Amino acid sequence: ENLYFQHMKHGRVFIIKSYSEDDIHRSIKYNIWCSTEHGNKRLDAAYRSMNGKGPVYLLFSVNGSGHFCGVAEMKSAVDYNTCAGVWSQDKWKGRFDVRWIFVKDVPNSQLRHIRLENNENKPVTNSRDTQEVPLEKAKQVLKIIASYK
Numbered sequence: 324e325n326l327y328f329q330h331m332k333h334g335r336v337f338i339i340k341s342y343s344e345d346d347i348h349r350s351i352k353y354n355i356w357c358s359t360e361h362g363n364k365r366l367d368a369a370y371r372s373m374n375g376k377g378p379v380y381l382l383f384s385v386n387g388s389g390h391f392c393g394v395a396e397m398k399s400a401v402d403y404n405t406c407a408g409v410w411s412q413d414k415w416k417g418r419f420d421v422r423w424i425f426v427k428d429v430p431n432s433q434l435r436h437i438r439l440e441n442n443e444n445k446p447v448t449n450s451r452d453t454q455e456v457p458l459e460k461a462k463q464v465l466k467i468i469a470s471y472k
């Protein structure tokens with residue numbers, strides 16, 4: 324058995340949906356990310372109120388790809404005044420640090436049966452950018468991602 328993820332009691336988990344495969348590559352290379360203004364505010368509030376008592380996990384998926392591509396942990400608050408245009412499109416203001424934990428394609432078929440009670444019971448695979456995942460469902464997703472081969 325594997326009862327690791329079943330044990331954590333503090334932590335918050337968010338879906339990250341990227342349109343760009345380049346930006347995923349850049350995120351892995353430099354351990355940084357940026358969301359929309361509204362998404363940045365959501366992640367920043369979750370990070371800051373966590374006050375180091377537990378992780379903020381980011382579950383990454385490219386829009387339309389049919390799979391998740393990996394897992395990262397938030398590693399700083401959001402810096403809103405940084406160099407513009409560093410991503411594939413010039414639509415982003417700011418930067419926060421991440422640490423990629425897992426880089427692996429996990430098909431949506433492995434995850435579509437986990438549904439989010441806070442998003443109308445929709446499959447976790449039908450989420451939008453910075454959709455938050457309830458911790459009990461997040462533990463289930465993390466275990467499937469870790470166990471996929």
Ligand SMILES: Cn1c(=O)cc(C2CC2)[nH]c1=O
Binds near residue numbers: 362415452
């Ligand atoms: C939806 N989406 C993208 O497609 C690309 C980015 C990059 C700045 C990191 N962020 C984002 O939220």
Ligand SMILES: [Cl-]
Binds near residue numbers: 456457458459
């Ligand atoms: Cl929860």
